[PDB]
Amino acid sequence: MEYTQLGRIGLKVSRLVLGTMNFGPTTDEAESHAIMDAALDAGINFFDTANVYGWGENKGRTEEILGSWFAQGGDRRDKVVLATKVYGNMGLDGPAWPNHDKLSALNIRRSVDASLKRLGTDHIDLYQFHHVDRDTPWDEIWQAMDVLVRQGKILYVGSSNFAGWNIAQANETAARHGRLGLVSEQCLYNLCERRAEMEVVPAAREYGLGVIAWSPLHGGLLGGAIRKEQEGGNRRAASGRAADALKDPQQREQIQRYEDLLDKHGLEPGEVALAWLLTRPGVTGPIVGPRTADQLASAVRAAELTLTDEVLTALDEIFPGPGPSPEAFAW
Amino acid sequence: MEYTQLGRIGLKVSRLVLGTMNFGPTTDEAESHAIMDAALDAGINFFDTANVYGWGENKGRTEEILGSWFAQGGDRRDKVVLATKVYGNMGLDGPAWPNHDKLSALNIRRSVDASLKRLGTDHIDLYQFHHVDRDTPWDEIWQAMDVLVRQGKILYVGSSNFAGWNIAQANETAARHGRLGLVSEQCLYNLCERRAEMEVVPAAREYGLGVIAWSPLHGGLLGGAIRKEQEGGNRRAASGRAADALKDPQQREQIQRYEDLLDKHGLEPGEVALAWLLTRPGVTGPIVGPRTADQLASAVRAAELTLTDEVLTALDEIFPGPGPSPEAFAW
Amino acid sequence: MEYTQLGRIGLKVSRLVLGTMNFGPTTDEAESHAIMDAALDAGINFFDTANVYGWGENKGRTEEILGSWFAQGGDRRDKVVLATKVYGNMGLDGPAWPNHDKLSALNIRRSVDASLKRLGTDHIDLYQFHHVDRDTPWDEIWQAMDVLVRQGKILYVGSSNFAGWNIAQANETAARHGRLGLVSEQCLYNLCERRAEMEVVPAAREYGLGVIAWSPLHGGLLGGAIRKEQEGGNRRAASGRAADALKDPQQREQIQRYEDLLDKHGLEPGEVALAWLLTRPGVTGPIVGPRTADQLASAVRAAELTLTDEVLTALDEIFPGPGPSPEAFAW
Amino acid sequence: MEYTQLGRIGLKVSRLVLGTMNFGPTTDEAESHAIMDAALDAGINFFDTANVYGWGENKGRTEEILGSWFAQGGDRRDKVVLATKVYGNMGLDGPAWPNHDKLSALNIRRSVDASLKRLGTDHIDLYQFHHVDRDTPWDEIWQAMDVLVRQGKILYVGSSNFAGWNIAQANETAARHGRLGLVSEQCLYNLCERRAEMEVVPAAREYGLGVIAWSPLHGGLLGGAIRKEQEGNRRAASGRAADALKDPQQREQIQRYEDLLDKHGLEPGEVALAWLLTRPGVTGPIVGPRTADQLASAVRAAELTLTDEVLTALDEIFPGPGPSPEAFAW
Ligand SMILES: CC[C@H]1OC(=O)C[C@@H](O)[C@H](C)[C@@H](O[C@@H]2O[C@H](C)[C@@H](O[C@H]3C[C@@](C)(O)[C@@H](O)[C@H](C)O3)[C@H](N(C)C)[C@H]2O)[C@@H](CC=O)C[C@@H](C)C(=O)/C=C/C(C)=C/[C@@H]1CO[C@@H]1O[C@H](C)[C@@H](O)[C@@H](OC)[C@H]1OC
Ligand SMILES: CC[C@H]1OC(=O)C[C@@H](O)[C@H](C)[C@@H](O[C@@H]2O[C@H](C)[C@@H](O[C@H]3C[C@@](C)(O)[C@@H](O)[C@H](C)O3)[C@H](N(C)C)[C@H]2O)[C@@H](CC=O)C[C@@H](C)C(=O)/C=C/C(C)=C/[C@@H]1CO[C@@H]1O[C@H](C)[C@@H](O)[C@@H](OC)[C@H]1OC
Ligand SMILES: NC(=O)c1ccc[n+]([C@@H]2O[C@H](COP(=O)([O-])OP(=O)(O)OC[C@H]3O[C@@H](n4cnc5c(N)ncnc54)[C@H](OP(=O)(O)O)[C@@H]3O)[C@@H](O)[C@H]2O)c1
Ligand SMILES: NC(=O)c1ccc[n+]([C@@H]2O[C@H](COP(=O)([O-])OP(=O)(O)OC[C@H]3O[C@@H](n4cnc5c(N)ncnc54)[C@H](OP(=O)(O)O)[C@@H]3O)[C@@H](O)[C@H]2O)c1
Ligand SMILES: NC(=O)c1ccc[n+]([C@@H]2O[C@H](COP(=O)([O-])OP(=O)(O)OC[C@H]3O[C@@H](n4cnc5c(N)ncnc54)[C@H](OP(=O)(O)O)[C@@H]3O)[C@@H](O)[C@H]2O)c1
Ligand SMILES: NC(=O)c1ccc[n+]([C@@H]2O[C@H](COP(=O)([O-])OP(=O)(O)OC[C@H]3O[C@@H](n4cnc5c(N)ncnc54)[C@H](OP(=O)(O)O)[C@@H]3O)[C@@H](O)[C@H]2O)c1
């Protein structure tokens, strides 16, 4: 396993981050536990979850599945950098009761206690904002997080789905009073969606944040979705983001070009999408989303792949990116 | 229910704040619980109380009534933004034993623990200074509040009965050392008393405080007190501020003009006075003071009223305001 | 002559400030020079002017009259604490060209250079904002003033026609970065208009500003305006604020009672109004507005008057004040 | 003329900003001076220029044309908020000598003195970075600007072609030590190019910067370029506009735009300027008249009220992304 620092901070992480969103709605508890055992065996020490994972009436289930895994002992909790999230509504889906979503100090306080209880742990290593909340100012947010840091309930704070200028405002505000700022941004970034290149990733690099890419396969779309389009099972690529893209002729053609390119080179589409993210400047690593232990083993192989310049150039032809602003749209 | 941010902060509140001062001395425990259940039913998530409410030998009773309400369960504590106050003497009415009133770190320590015990909760969401204390410096006050913040016993700090320059000094002092300042000012503001427009509300707006208006009907004076002047009940308008106003020929003539105006437009005096405050720039909302469940329902109707330009202009004729200083008295 | 520190700073000033607004439009250049010589002979070391004084097409004339006075030599400039103002339109009366009024760094730059030229001096001792400018932020204002301080073009900065919270915001902003804040506020304050007591003077005193009362006789109204109502000459009391007040029945009765009281006590109304301001806590002194040398001589006598407690009580009853906020309108 | 505060600061500016890039290479000195007199007559008090304007061997000519304008007197300098730029190479076109371009304190020092001399003035009201310079840190940049502020050579500092996170970093750095930060961002923004909506404008709004839009007609492309395509010089015949008209999809977009405004009897240049005036946070467009009639046309656009029907139609023809992260994530 290849390791790196998470941005500027002292925390060392596997360049594969284990996502857990599938654990519950798509992968059951026993296979979820097997995937986490295999992840630990492979040297993956960095797990990403969220309070809302589990979905609908089962929001919180994923954290509970991690909690029963940790409860088995065997140094699992000691070994893992445990990340979860606050922002989402944990009540009945639909409009949230006021301050039962978003980033008020009020919702931060109740959300962290519920996550700690489901996870069966006394601390979260990386507590992440799930989304920017434009209505909560950073002196309120940093007050709430600093309460948790000094109580020992969290160690690090990260962001997810921020704009670049939110990262800068957040960390400048933290730095004025000596607080450790955001240590990582968790952003949508993959071959299909590269617009985090314009400002989010440049800002994260300037401020020394880790960058961990969520939906690195675009929801399974990049994992061989066309070749697999007729298979059964509870495949993630059969619904949601990937299925929507495959109904668009232009997006489907792109994915078809991708799968045909890789057939000519003896490469696997999911493994290449992961390996591609590992070449991007500033990217700590993809947050892999295995549905099966087999798909985790494939991810470990992806982290060992060396993409040739020829393949990288061809991928840029199919999936061009904008580069940084202002050059992306001005000069 | 209409919602808004409390000034600049991330807390979302109903634009009706439920005042509880009547609960105890005027409304009994059973009916207070009914009013609070109905407030939650109508979407009101923001309750104001004080340690002194109850009055006399029953100071603390209002908080205890809220404590018994919370103790039923039913997500009541989780759903409510709970505001209470410190400054008042909680001992025998009359001159307080030194440091058993006002805002020393000593009285803050003892008042908050006594409030938490009566409320049956481990934290207060909005802890308010009941009045400015000119003898306690802001580095002493912010030390005391920051102790409670970091212990998790409070979340936010607010002011009540401040001058505008007190708000500015408090929040500039807080900002110097990373602290969230005052998030709201609770001030006397209604059709009868508009002098908060001079400097209190302008300073609150500059510093991004919510503004929540206490005695929004001037103690019942604006709720139809002339028409109801001969009625029984233990009506708040039969005593105190309202009764005193009706003794004065000029103030009584003003209320008469008001009630006669509203008869011509088919409007209710109590609802119009609440709806008028909701139109004022910077006002988060009125802190309604229902004596009955029907009066809470009437307040909810008031929050849906749309006052016409013609009625707003007429109210300004009856109840002119000074505008901001310096223009209010100089140029 | 009685001297005092100007609030908290090391500058010592006479408790009569010589106002120059009459110099030009009401008092001609030679009599203006005689009044300034008489003021210096009496120990008055503190002169207030403004760029706009002169009025109309003659804006700047008063500063020029002071300039020709200083140009006479004889240690006049070295002896005088020279105060002038920025904010007013110096162009054609009417709507100003953008940034040719108010407190942008652009207007501050052009205004001070024009004042310095008219006054015939290389520095202004006290450069005052004529009025709050709600559209210019304090980091812009203090940048512009600090440029002038470091160049040696001004020494001290003062306010005029501020609200109390503006004083607080201004001086907290200056103190953040080691700058000397406002040293004095120049507000309307006299027997007739006491609402600076609510917040402006309390804020000034908290922050250690001098308080220099402008229009101390309410534009001549308190100088015997009723007794002299039939007189000729270009008396200031025949126009503007004083004339408007004498056409008001209640203000006229107030002034009549005042003049009758002072007839009974054998006291001069102009002198008493000045002596009254000298008793008010926090007041550095009145800015006298003599039209003649004899009126200056009269002001000097006023500074040596001791009003009996009987007269002081009678004045407070004829001319009541509001006291400080929040007590002035709440409790 | 409608006026507004420049973002959060005390400076008041007309919502039309007079751009001067045409003065010299496209509009001659006499006509440039007439456009500036007409701008002042209509109440425009805010002029944008740059040291490089004039182009090639004539870089600096535009500042000189403004300088001879000011030299005529009549309160012209006192009335105008004068904005210019530092970053561009002022030597021979091609790779610049080291530190004769970009934002080092060394190049800032030499560039401002040369602009002051050409402009014939002792101060610049708004001195703008022409482009983000990723190699110069903000404590160096603010040192250099503060030197100029304390000497009276500039009043305000603004940015141009920044990313949103650059605006935040600059102004947080400035605020740490009591300095007034950036007061304005000058970005490309018009119907054709709306990606400043992702982060640049949202960051400017949060930090209280003015937002002034350069090439508001996309270089004349939005001024009726297809109707005038065979006319006889015209900025639309070259550069950004010409390239867009060579592309089938952009040409079709502009053809749809010009058809839409034919139906409503409106002028394309005026509508494109009026459209920017409706965008939240936009101080106004930096108009680029080549002629005095084009300036009077801009003044008419500032009085125009676009109906909601037309605004909806423009938005469908010229969709924008809105803010990040929602623009690409959720
Ligand atoms: C010393 C005891 C005296 O008490 C006073 O003289 C107090 C009066 O001057 C009050 C305060 C005035 O009431 C004020 O009328 C001003 C014009 C307002 O000022 C305005 C304009 C402004 C610019 O000032 C602004 O700042 C302010 C906010 O609003 C002000 N406002 C707050 C509303 C308002 O209180 C008057 C109206 C004016 O004359 C109010 C009405 C009801 C009135 O006739 C009362 C008469 C009384 C009780 C007189 C006795 C008689 O006792 C007398 O005692 C004297 C010492 C002797 O001369 C006695 O001789 C026997 C005897 O005279 C008859
Ligand atoms: C008002 C309703 C109209 O809807 C539109 O006009 C939307 C179109 O303008 C879209 C957005 C364009 O698609 C855009 O093509 C630009 C050149 C790209 O811009 C480029 C360059 C850039 C510089 O802009 C850069 O910033 C950007 C990121 O990428 C842009 N990109 C975001 C990809 C891309 O969305 C066009 C391609 C060019 O025209 C996409 C293709 C599929 C198309 O023909 C669609 C036609 C439709 C549906 C037309 C109706 C006709 O309805 C018509 O309604 C009008 C109101 C009337 O004129 C009617 O005529 C009478 C009627 O015509 C029948
Ligand atoms: N911060 C946020 O907003 C956010 C949002 C989404 C996700 N996340 C995080 O990012 C993690 C990953 O997101 P995601 O589940 O959408 O990831 P993804 O990798 O884009 O989608 C997962 C799907 O890709 C396929 N796949 C996974 N590994 C593969 C491999 N080695 N080879 C071929 N196909 C493979 C599987 O598709 P099939 O099931 O069709 O076989 C799998 O179900 C989540 O667990 C969560 O922790 C964060
Ligand atoms: N910070 C402070 O110093 C301070 C001071 C006072 C109050 N407060 C807070 O502000 C809250 C409200 O104060 P308040 O009780 O004096 O409010 P208020 O609304 O001015 O007076 C309450 C009275 O108004 C009448 N009323 C209430 N709702 C009505 C409606 N919808 N229609 C017609 N009449 C209506 C009732 O009068 P009748 O009983 O005659 O029917 C009621 O007893 C208090 O509960 C407390 O939370 C704070
Ligand atoms: N910062 C501001 O906004 C502002 C506004 C106004 C003034 N000021 C400053 O404050 C200064 C004073 O203002 P002001 O001229 O309006 O003062 P004022 O004393 O209220 O009015 C002056 C008039 O009072 C009469 N008077 C003056 N001294 C007298 C005395 N000893 N005995 C009897 N009557 C006397 C004269 O009236 P008659 O002519 O009728 O005899 C004189 O013209 C100005 O010179 C200016 O420096 C500042
Ligand atoms: N910060 C930067 O990087 C940057 C870059 C470029 C420009 N700028 C600034 O932005 C200003 C404007 O840029 P620009 O010249 O490219 O603006 P523009 O409006 O996009 O293009 C100017 C052209 O549009 C046409 N036009 C102008 N006004 C018109 C009207 N009222 N009706 C119809 N057509 C009209 C004319 O084209 P025809 O000649 O074909 O008639 C004119 O030459 C410049 O002067 C400069 O100050 C800044």
Residue numbers in the entry:
A (entry chain H), B (entry chain D), C (entry chain C): 1 to 331
D (entry chain A): 1 to 232, 234 to 331
Manuscript text:
We obtained AKRtyl ternary complex with NADP+ and tylosin at 1.93 Å by cocrystallizing AKRtyl in the presence of cofactor and substrate at a molar ratio of 1:1.2:10 (AKRtyl: NADP+: tylosin). The structure of this complex is similar to the AKRtyl-NADPH binary complex. In the ternary complex, we found an incredible phenomenon that one AKRtyl monomer binds two molecules of tylosin - one at the substrate binding site where the reaction happens and the other at a remote site which is 15 Å away from the active site. The first tylosin (orthosteric tylosin, abbreviated as tylosino) at the active site is refined with an occupancy of 79% and the position is different compared with that of the second NADPH in the AKRtyl-NADPH binary complex, thus excluding the possibility of NADP+ binding. Tylosino is close to NADP+ with its C20 aldehyde carbon, the one to be reduced, 3.8 Å from the para-carbon of the cofactor’s nicotinamide ring. The distance between the aldehyde oxygen and the phenolic hydroxyl of Tyr53 is 3.0 Å. Outside the active site, the second tylosin binds above the two extra helices α7 and α10 which lay outside the TIM barrel. It has slightly higher occupancy of 93% with well-defined electron density except for the glycosyl β-d-mycinose. In addition, out of the eight subunits in one octamer, six subunits bind tylosin while the other two is blocked by adjacent asymmetric units due to crystal packing. The distance between the C20 aldehyde on the tylosin and the para-carbon of the nicotinamide ring of NADP+ is 25 Å thus its reduction is impossible. The remote tylosina binding site revealed that there were relatively few polar interactions, with hydrogen bonding between Glu193 and Arg195 and the C4 hydroxyl of α-l-mycarose, as well as Glu253 and Arg257 and the C20 aldehyde on tylosina.
